[PDB]
Amino acid sequence: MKNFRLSEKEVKTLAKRIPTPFLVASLDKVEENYQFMRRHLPRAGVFYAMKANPTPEILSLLAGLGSHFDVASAGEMEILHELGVDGSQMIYANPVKDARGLKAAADYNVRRFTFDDPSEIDKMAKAVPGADVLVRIAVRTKFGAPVEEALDLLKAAQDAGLHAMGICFHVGSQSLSTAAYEEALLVARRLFDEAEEMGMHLTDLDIGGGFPVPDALNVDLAAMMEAINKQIDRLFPDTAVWTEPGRYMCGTAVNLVTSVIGTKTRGEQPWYILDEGIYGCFSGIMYDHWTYPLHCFGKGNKKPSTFGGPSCDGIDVLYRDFMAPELKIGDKVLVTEMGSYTSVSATRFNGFYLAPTIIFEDQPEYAAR
Amino acid sequence: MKNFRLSEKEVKTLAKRIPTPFLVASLDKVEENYQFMRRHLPRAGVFYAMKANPTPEILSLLAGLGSHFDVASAGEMEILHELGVDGSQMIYANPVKDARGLKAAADYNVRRFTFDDPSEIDKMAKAVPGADVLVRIAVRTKFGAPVEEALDLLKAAQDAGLHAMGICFHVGSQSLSTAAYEEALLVARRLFDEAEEMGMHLTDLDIGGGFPVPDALNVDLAAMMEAINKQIDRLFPDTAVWTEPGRYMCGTAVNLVTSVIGTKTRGEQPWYILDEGIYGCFSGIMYDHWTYPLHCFGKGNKKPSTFGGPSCDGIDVLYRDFMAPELKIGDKVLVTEMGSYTSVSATRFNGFYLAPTIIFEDQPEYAAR
Ligand SMILES: [Mg+2]
Ligand SMILES: [Mg+2]
Ligand SMILES: [Mg+2]
Ligand SMILES: [Mg+2]
């Protein structure tokens, strides 16, 4: 199960009929990522963190697979709502909610909410009386209550008429270590037992996301999941457990196709200007501190090269001292691992359009494969 | 001529009928900025760098004042086109242009282009034969040709059938010093004289933008402009001169109104969660490295406080150790100097909506003033 990657040959045919920049998403790779987690982490229901990639066809696919969704705003709920997904398939997992989100949640039957602060309680009580709440704990600044505050928060939520349902945590570092998940599970187990004595019965546990990215998927990743799963089955036999994969689901299912629109050859280091930049899909360099494999298809010897985005900004520099062949205006390059926290942070700065996401499975290139 | 600033009283009335976050733009302040530059820098025609703020009503206002526009993409041309602005009022001042931009330029009668590289010539020659070109010089990495390459570039453009029209430079640091503008003017004067001997007659000079921001406007800023203007009248009596103000035009004409939607009071330092963040108008913290005056309207004693945005991201932190009164959910705060490179870099990340820009002059609060 390889990471999705267009061939030089497919790049060229796509770009003849689709103007660059564009992204190409493989629904089959998304499905493979989903089934892999199902196979090796069966105990955890999936709350897909759609903030990572909200492409409508990806969301429809996941929903038909049985996925639930972690939503952060009215906007995300609205996107899902248009695809026929109900609030019963959502959790409003933004710890601090606004009026619009709360109204959308009530409109679309979202009953599950997360919170970490006493200030969030009355607002949820008024907006969705009797709703199910999970307290977010910090097992380690912006989010999560102190472990030893968790059950008083759930109790206060119960006092205000909400249903104290469970606990969630986030411990994913994108490391292969299971230690941090397993550790969190032991803390959660203790709080679940203490809660029973306080007149609460907790039923759901959410272990968050931030899984390691799949190999350009592999056995070590499968083994980590099996190990998490074994601890879940041991510790929480009768509890509904959930995970919130985001990057994991789509990061490796999408690529970016971008054209060289300018060169500068006067420096020792040649510069190539691409038609997508740091204000577009590469915004993930700014916000996500991420790096994306760049593939140039040139034959010849290569020299350290700079790639810049199309903006009038000086900051729109993508790669420096990158070994690359001599490229010319009109050449297409290919950037992989472009599925997560890239397109979602794109802007209309300078009036540039949002690069569209094209579905591979709907293209002649797919049948040929 | 003060910087635009809503009163506590206007904030409250606005927010009762407009849900936060929203921006409020003062057309009168924009006009005042424009007329100020006209008054003190009469020689320079204005190419408004709309990338800084493309609010339709601001653009309509400027166009009716006689402003021209510096456009960077098809998208920007399209925005202007919908407001009845013609390409005769535009310069396509992105040194590396794409197919869509070039097609929009031909559709909307844009005849003026800037360039800095030999690779850009043939593309412009094919797209807009005979168009007027200005070479961008570096007087100081992404943009600008070496000074001593400038006239060979203009000559090569002439060879390909384009019209060698002039030169532009960018030297604005947002310092009060005129030295850098004046210096550039002497370089330009030398190239204009050399060009005459090479069979070119240059007619237009563009001195770029990056003016100092107007005082929370002032006499020192007026004096700088008068001094630039005096050197323009001396050096370039018969040349059409232009400037590309961006930040200067609107930065001080717009404010952001945002609500406290959550608090965290358990730390020594209280945290306030606002309904606009780093993925929205405060994206200028990321891309523009800028700082925005924050005004809280509270009565009481104040303590170092953190303000965070509404996102599920950890990075959405706006102000730390900021002296602030005790604020509560539902309180509105006010951020000034929010007119430039803020809204333009906002995203739909997490599904959040783009904060809309409301025109002050269309509000009951304006008449009351
Ligand atoms: Mg993940
Ligand atoms: Mg159990
Ligand atoms: Mg300026
Ligand atoms: Mg002259």
JSON list of C-alpha atoms in Angstrom, two decimals, chain A residues 19-21 51-52 72-76 78-79 93-100 116-120 123 136 141-146 149 153 261-266 271 273 275 278-280 282-284 286-289 308-317 320 329 341 344-353, chain B residues 19-21 51-52 72-76 78-79 93-100 116-120 123 136 141-146 149 153 261-266 271 273 275 278-280 282-284 286-289 308-317 320 329 341 344-353:
[
{"chain": "A", "resi": 19, "resn": "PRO", "atom": "CA", "xyz": [-4.90, 24.12, -15.81]},
{"chain": "A", "resi": 20, "resn": "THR", "atom": "CA", "xyz": [-2.31, 24.09, -13.00]},
{"chain": "A", "resi": 21, "resn": "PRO", "atom": "CA", "xyz": [-2.18, 24.40, -10.05]},
{"chain": "A", "resi": 51, "resn": "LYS", "atom": "CA", "xyz": [-10.16, 20.23, 9.26]},
{"chain": "A", "resi": 52, "resn": "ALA", "atom": "CA", "xyz": [-7.23, 18.36, 7.76]},
{"chain": "A", "resi": 72, "resn": "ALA", "atom": "CA", "xyz": [-14.83, 22.41, 14.73]},
{"chain": "A", "resi": 73, "resn": "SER", "atom": "CA", "xyz": [-17.31, 25.00, 13.50]},
{"chain": "A", "resi": 74, "resn": "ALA", "atom": "CA", "xyz": [-20.73, 25.70, 11.92]},
{"chain": "A", "resi": 75, "resn": "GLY", "atom": "CA", "xyz": [-18.94, 25.73, 8.56]},
{"chain": "A", "resi": 76, "resn": "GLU", "atom": "CA", "xyz": [-17.68, 22.20, 8.89]},
{"chain": "A", "resi": 78, "resn": "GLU", "atom": "CA", "xyz": [-22.63, 22.76, 6.97]},
{"chain": "A", "resi": 79, "resn": "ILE", "atom": "CA", "xyz": [-20.21, 21.06, 4.59]},
{"chain": "A", "resi": 93, "resn": "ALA", "atom": "CA", "xyz": [-14.94, 18.81, 19.33]},
{"chain": "A", "resi": 94, "resn": "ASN", "atom": "CA", "xyz": [-13.90, 22.40, 19.56]},
{"chain": "A", "resi": 95, "resn": "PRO", "atom": "CA", "xyz": [-13.50, 23.16, 23.27]},
{"chain": "A", "resi": 96, "resn": "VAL", "atom": "CA", "xyz": [-14.67, 26.76, 22.86]},
{"chain": "A", "resi": 97, "resn": "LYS", "atom": "CA", "xyz": [-17.78, 27.10, 20.72]},
{"chain": "A", "resi": 98, "resn": "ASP", "atom": "CA", "xyz": [-19.48, 30.13, 19.20]},
{"chain": "A", "resi": 99, "resn": "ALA", "atom": "CA", "xyz": [-23.14, 30.96, 18.72]},
{"chain": "A", "resi": 100, "resn": "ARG", "atom": "CA", "xyz": [-23.26, 29.89, 15.10]},
{"chain": "A", "resi": 116, "resn": "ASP", "atom": "CA", "xyz": [-12.16, 21.82, 28.99]},
{"chain": "A", "resi": 117, "resn": "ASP", "atom": "CA", "xyz": [-13.27, 24.81, 31.06]},
{"chain": "A", "resi": 118, "resn": "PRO", "atom": "CA", "xyz": [-15.94, 25.81, 33.55]},
{"chain": "A", "resi": 119, "resn": "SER", "atom": "CA", "xyz": [-16.89, 28.78, 31.29]},
{"chain": "A", "resi": 120, "resn": "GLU", "atom": "CA", "xyz": [-18.03, 26.52, 28.47]},
{"chain": "A", "resi": 123, "resn": "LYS", "atom": "CA", "xyz": [-23.37, 27.99, 27.01]},
{"chain": "A", "resi": 136, "resn": "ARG", "atom": "CA", "xyz": [-10.78, 17.06, 27.35]},
{"chain": "A", "resi": 141, "resn": "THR", "atom": "CA", "xyz": [-1.66, 24.77, 26.75]},
{"chain": "A", "resi": 142, "resn": "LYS", "atom": "CA", "xyz": [-4.60, 26.00, 24.65]},
{"chain": "A", "resi": 143, "resn": "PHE", "atom": "CA", "xyz": [-6.67, 22.87, 25.30]},
{"chain": "A", "resi": 144, "resn": "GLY", "atom": "CA", "xyz": [-7.24, 20.35, 28.10]},
{"chain": "A", "resi": 145, "resn": "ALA", "atom": "CA", "xyz": [-8.10, 20.54, 31.75]},
{"chain": "A", "resi": 146, "resn": "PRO", "atom": "CA", "xyz": [-5.83, 19.29, 34.46]},
{"chain": "A", "resi": 149, "resn": "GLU", "atom": "CA", "xyz": [-9.94, 18.84, 37.56]},
{"chain": "A", "resi": 153, "resn": "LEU", "atom": "CA", "xyz": [-15.86, 19.58, 35.37]},
{"chain": "A", "resi": 261, "resn": "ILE", "atom": "CA", "xyz": [5.83, 29.85, -14.84]},
{"chain": "A", "resi": 262, "resn": "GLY", "atom": "CA", "xyz": [9.09, 31.74, -14.64]},
{"chain": "A", "resi": 263, "resn": "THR", "atom": "CA", "xyz": [12.78, 31.18, -14.19]},
{"chain": "A", "resi": 264, "resn": "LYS", "atom": "CA", "xyz": [15.64, 33.33, -13.09]},
{"chain": "A", "resi": 265, "resn": "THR", "atom": "CA", "xyz": [18.97, 31.98, -14.36]},
{"chain": "A", "resi": 266, "resn": "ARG", "atom": "CA", "xyz": [21.34, 34.88, -13.59]},
{"chain": "A", "resi": 271, "resn": "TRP", "atom": "CA", "xyz": [15.21, 30.03, -9.48]},
{"chain": "A", "resi": 273, "resn": "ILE", "atom": "CA", "xyz": [8.66, 30.23, -10.12]},
{"chain": "A", "resi": 275, "resn": "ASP", "atom": "CA", "xyz": [2.10, 28.69, -9.98]},
{"chain": "A", "resi": 278, "resn": "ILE", "atom": "CA", "xyz": [3.05, 29.80, 0.32]},
{"chain": "A", "resi": 279, "resn": "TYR", "atom": "CA", "xyz": [-0.35, 31.65, 0.14]},
{"chain": "A", "resi": 280, "resn": "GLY", "atom": "CA", "xyz": [-1.90, 28.51, -1.33]},
{"chain": "A", "resi": 282, "resn": "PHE", "atom": "CA", "xyz": [2.29, 25.58, 0.75]},
{"chain": "A", "resi": 283, "resn": "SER", "atom": "CA", "xyz": [0.72, 27.59, 3.57]},
{"chain": "A", "resi": 284, "resn": "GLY", "atom": "CA", "xyz": [1.40, 24.36, 5.49]},
{"chain": "A", "resi": 286, "resn": "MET", "atom": "CA", "xyz": [3.87, 28.50, 7.67]},
{"chain": "A", "resi": 287, "resn": "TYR", "atom": "CA", "xyz": [1.21, 26.99, 9.82]},
{"chain": "A", "resi": 288, "resn": "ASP", "atom": "CA", "xyz": [2.04, 23.26, 9.94]},
{"chain": "A", "resi": 289, "resn": "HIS", "atom": "CA", "xyz": [5.83, 23.55, 9.87]},
{"chain": "A", "resi": 308, "resn": "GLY", "atom": "CA", "xyz": [9.44, 30.27, -5.36]},
{"chain": "A", "resi": 309, "resn": "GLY", "atom": "CA", "xyz": [5.67, 30.77, -5.40]},
{"chain": "A", "resi": 310, "resn": "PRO", "atom": "CA", "xyz": [3.78, 33.15, -7.68]},
{"chain": "A", "resi": 311, "resn": "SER", "atom": "CA", "xyz": [3.17, 35.93, -5.18]},
{"chain": "A", "resi": 312, "resn": "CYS", "atom": "CA", "xyz": [4.50, 39.48, -5.09]},
{"chain": "A", "resi": 313, "resn": "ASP", "atom": "CA", "xyz": [5.67, 38.64, -1.60]},
{"chain": "A", "resi": 314, "resn": "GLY", "atom": "CA", "xyz": [9.34, 38.02, -0.75]},
{"chain": "A", "resi": 315, "resn": "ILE", "atom": "CA", "xyz": [8.34, 35.33, 1.73]},
{"chain": "A", "resi": 316, "resn": "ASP", "atom": "CA", "xyz": [6.97, 33.07, -0.99]},
{"chain": "A", "resi": 317, "resn": "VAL", "atom": "CA", "xyz": [9.99, 30.79, -1.14]},
{"chain": "A", "resi": 320, "resn": "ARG", "atom": "CA", "xyz": [16.24, 26.38, -1.32]},
{"chain": "A", "resi": 329, "resn": "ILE", "atom": "CA", "xyz": [8.57, 27.49, -18.38]},
{"chain": "A", "resi": 341, "resn": "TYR", "atom": "CA", "xyz": [-3.20, 21.00, 6.27]},
{"chain": "A", "resi": 344, "resn": "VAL", "atom": "CA", "xyz": [-7.24, 24.02, 3.95]},
{"chain": "A", "resi": 345, "resn": "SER", "atom": "CA", "xyz": [-5.02, 27.00, 4.84]},
{"chain": "A", "resi": 346, "resn": "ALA", "atom": "CA", "xyz": [-4.93, 28.51, 1.32]},
{"chain": "A", "resi": 347, "resn": "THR", "atom": "CA", "xyz": [-5.96, 32.13, 0.78]},
{"chain": "A", "resi": 348, "resn": "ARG", "atom": "CA", "xyz": [-7.06, 34.43, -2.01]},
{"chain": "A", "resi": 349, "resn": "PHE", "atom": "CA", "xyz": [-4.12, 36.73, -1.35]},
{"chain": "A", "resi": 350, "resn": "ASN", "atom": "CA", "xyz": [-3.06, 38.64, -4.47]},
{"chain": "A", "resi": 351, "resn": "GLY", "atom": "CA", "xyz": [-6.34, 37.48, -5.98]},
{"chain": "A", "resi": 352, "resn": "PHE", "atom": "CA", "xyz": [-5.00, 34.01, -6.73]},
{"chain": "A", "resi": 353, "resn": "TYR", "atom": "CA", "xyz": [-7.61, 31.29, -7.03]},
{"chain": "B", "resi": 19, "resn": "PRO", "atom": "CA", "xyz": [-22.46, 39.08, 14.60]},
{"chain": "B", "resi": 20, "resn": "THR", "atom": "CA", "xyz": [-18.72, 39.17, 15.42]},
{"chain": "B", "resi": 21, "resn": "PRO", "atom": "CA", "xyz": [-16.11, 38.88, 14.04]},
{"chain": "B", "resi": 51, "resn": "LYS", "atom": "CA", "xyz": [-3.53, 43.09, -2.64]},
{"chain": "B", "resi": 52, "resn": "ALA", "atom": "CA", "xyz": [-3.37, 44.99, 0.63]},
{"chain": "B", "resi": 72, "resn": "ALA", "atom": "CA", "xyz": [-1.15, 40.90, -9.42]},
{"chain": "B", "resi": 73, "resn": "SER", "atom": "CA", "xyz": [-3.43, 38.27, -10.92]},
{"chain": "B", "resi": 74, "resn": "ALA", "atom": "CA", "xyz": [-6.51, 37.51, -13.07]},
{"chain": "B", "resi": 75, "resn": "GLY", "atom": "CA", "xyz": [-8.51, 37.48, -9.82]},
{"chain": "B", "resi": 76, "resn": "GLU", "atom": "CA", "xyz": [-7.63, 41.02, -8.93]},
{"chain": "B", "resi": 78, "resn": "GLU", "atom": "CA", "xyz": [-11.78, 40.39, -12.22]},
{"chain": "B", "resi": 79, "resn": "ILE", "atom": "CA", "xyz": [-12.63, 42.10, -8.94]},
{"chain": "B", "resi": 93, "resn": "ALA", "atom": "CA", "xyz": [2.71, 44.53, -11.87]},
{"chain": "B", "resi": 94, "resn": "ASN", "atom": "CA", "xyz": [3.49, 40.95, -11.06]},
{"chain": "B", "resi": 95, "resn": "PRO", "atom": "CA", "xyz": [6.90, 40.22, -12.58]},
{"chain": "B", "resi": 96, "resn": "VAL", "atom": "CA", "xyz": [6.00, 36.60, -13.36]},
{"chain": "B", "resi": 97, "resn": "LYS", "atom": "CA", "xyz": [2.59, 36.21, -14.96]},
{"chain": "B", "resi": 98, "resn": "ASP", "atom": "CA", "xyz": [0.45, 33.15, -15.64]},
{"chain": "B", "resi": 99, "resn": "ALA", "atom": "CA", "xyz": [-1.80, 32.26, -18.54]},
{"chain": "B", "resi": 100, "resn": "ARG", "atom": "CA", "xyz": [-5.00, 33.30, -16.83]},
{"chain": "B", "resi": 116, "resn": "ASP", "atom": "CA", "xyz": [12.49, 41.62, -14.33]},
{"chain": "B", "resi": 117, "resn": "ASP", "atom": "CA", "xyz": [13.76, 38.63, -16.32]},
{"chain": "B", "resi": 118, "resn": "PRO", "atom": "CA", "xyz": [14.56, 37.62, -19.87]},
{"chain": "B", "resi": 119, "resn": "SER", "atom": "CA", "xyz": [12.17, 34.62, -19.52]},
{"chain": "B", "resi": 120, "resn": "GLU", "atom": "CA", "xyz": [9.14, 36.85, -19.10]},
{"chain": "B", "resi": 123, "resn": "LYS", "atom": "CA", "xyz": [5.19, 35.30, -22.95]},
{"chain": "B", "resi": 136, "resn": "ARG", "atom": "CA", "xyz": [11.72, 46.38, -12.34]},
{"chain": "B", "resi": 141, "resn": "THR", "atom": "CA", "xyz": [15.91, 38.79, -4.13]},
{"chain": "B", "resi": 142, "resn": "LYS", "atom": "CA", "xyz": [12.62, 37.51, -5.59]},
{"chain": "B", "resi": 143, "resn": "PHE", "atom": "CA", "xyz": [12.10, 40.62, -7.73]},
{"chain": "B", "resi": 144, "resn": "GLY", "atom": "CA", "xyz": [14.19, 43.14, -9.65]},
{"chain": "B", "resi": 145, "resn": "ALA", "atom": "CA", "xyz": [16.91, 42.97, -12.24]},
{"chain": "B", "resi": 146, "resn": "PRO", "atom": "CA", "xyz": [20.38, 44.27, -11.65]},
{"chain": "B", "resi": 149, "resn": "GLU", "atom": "CA", "xyz": [20.97, 44.69, -16.78]},
{"chain": "B", "resi": 153, "resn": "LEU", "atom": "CA", "xyz": [16.10, 43.86, -20.77]},
{"chain": "B", "resi": 261, "resn": "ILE", "atom": "CA", "xyz": [-16.11, 33.50, 23.41]},
{"chain": "B", "resi": 262, "resn": "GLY", "atom": "CA", "xyz": [-14.27, 31.65, 26.13]},
{"chain": "B", "resi": 263, "resn": "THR", "atom": "CA", "xyz": [-12.03, 32.27, 29.09]},
{"chain": "B", "resi": 264, "resn": "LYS", "atom": "CA", "xyz": [-9.60, 30.16, 31.01]},
{"chain": "B", "resi": 265, "resn": "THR", "atom": "CA", "xyz": [-9.03, 31.54, 34.52]},
{"chain": "B", "resi": 266, "resn": "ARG", "atom": "CA", "xyz": [-7.13, 28.68, 36.19]},
{"chain": "B", "resi": 271, "resn": "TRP", "atom": "CA", "xyz": [-6.75, 33.48, 28.79]},
{"chain": "B", "resi": 273, "resn": "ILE", "atom": "CA", "xyz": [-10.61, 33.19, 23.47]},
{"chain": "B", "resi": 275, "resn": "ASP", "atom": "CA", "xyz": [-13.82, 34.65, 17.72]},
{"chain": "B", "resi": 278, "resn": "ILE", "atom": "CA", "xyz": [-4.44, 33.63, 13.34]},
{"chain": "B", "resi": 279, "resn": "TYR", "atom": "CA", "xyz": [-6.29, 31.73, 10.52]},
{"chain": "B", "resi": 280, "resn": "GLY", "atom": "CA", "xyz": [-8.39, 34.84, 9.90]},
{"chain": "B", "resi": 282, "resn": "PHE", "atom": "CA", "xyz": [-4.51, 37.84, 12.44]},
{"chain": "B", "resi": 283, "resn": "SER", "atom": "CA", "xyz": [-2.85, 35.83, 9.67]},
{"chain": "B", "resi": 284, "resn": "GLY", "atom": "CA", "xyz": [-0.89, 39.09, 9.26]},
{"chain": "B", "resi": 286, "resn": "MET", "atom": "CA", "xyz": [2.29, 35.00, 10.33]},
{"chain": "B", "resi": 287, "resn": "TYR", "atom": "CA", "xyz": [2.78, 36.49, 6.93]},
{"chain": "B", "resi": 288, "resn": "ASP", "atom": "CA", "xyz": [3.26, 40.23, 7.56]},
{"chain": "B", "resi": 289, "resn": "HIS", "atom": "CA", "xyz": [5.12, 39.98, 10.86]},
{"chain": "B", "resi": 308, "resn": "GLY", "atom": "CA", "xyz": [-6.11, 33.20, 21.73]},
{"chain": "B", "resi": 309, "resn": "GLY", "atom": "CA", "xyz": [-8.04, 32.65, 18.50]},
{"chain": "B", "resi": 310, "resn": "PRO", "atom": "CA", "xyz": [-10.94, 30.23, 18.05]},
{"chain": "B", "resi": 311, "resn": "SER", "atom": "CA", "xyz": [-9.05, 27.46, 16.28]},
{"chain": "B", "resi": 312, "resn": "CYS", "atom": "CA", "xyz": [-8.26, 23.93, 17.40]},
{"chain": "B", "resi": 313, "resn": "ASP", "atom": "CA", "xyz": [-4.66, 24.81, 16.64]},
{"chain": "B", "resi": 314, "resn": "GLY", "atom": "CA", "xyz": [-2.08, 25.48, 19.37]},
{"chain": "B", "resi": 315, "resn": "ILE", "atom": "CA", "xyz": [-0.49, 28.17, 17.24]},
{"chain": "B", "resi": 316, "resn": "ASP", "atom": "CA", "xyz": [-3.56, 30.39, 17.41]},
{"chain": "B", "resi": 317, "resn": "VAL", "atom": "CA", "xyz": [-2.18, 32.71, 20.08]},
{"chain": "B", "resi": 320, "resn": "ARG", "atom": "CA", "xyz": [0.77, 37.20, 25.53]},
{"chain": "B", "resi": 329, "resn": "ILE", "atom": "CA", "xyz": [-17.81, 35.87, 27.54]},
{"chain": "B", "resi": 341, "resn": "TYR", "atom": "CA", "xyz": [-2.59, 42.39, 4.88]},
{"chain": "B", "resi": 344, "resn": "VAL", "atom": "CA", "xyz": [-6.59, 39.30, 2.59]},
{"chain": "B", "resi": 345, "resn": "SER", "atom": "CA", "xyz": [-4.66, 36.36, 4.07]},
{"chain": "B", "resi": 346, "resn": "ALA", "atom": "CA", "xyz": [-7.63, 34.82, 5.95]},
{"chain": "B", "resi": 347, "resn": "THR", "atom": "CA", "xyz": [-8.58, 31.18, 5.35]},
{"chain": "B", "resi": 348, "resn": "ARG", "atom": "CA", "xyz": [-11.51, 28.86, 5.84]},
{"chain": "B", "resi": 349, "resn": "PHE", "atom": "CA", "xyz": [-9.43, 26.59, 8.05]},
{"chain": "B", "resi": 350, "resn": "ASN", "atom": "CA", "xyz": [-11.55, 24.68, 10.56]},
{"chain": "B", "resi": 351, "resn": "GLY", "atom": "CA", "xyz": [-14.53, 25.79, 8.49]},
{"chain": "B", "resi": 352, "resn": "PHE", "atom": "CA", "xyz": [-14.55, 29.27, 10.00]},
{"chain": "B", "resi": 353, "resn": "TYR", "atom": "CA", "xyz": [-16.16, 31.94, 7.88]}
]
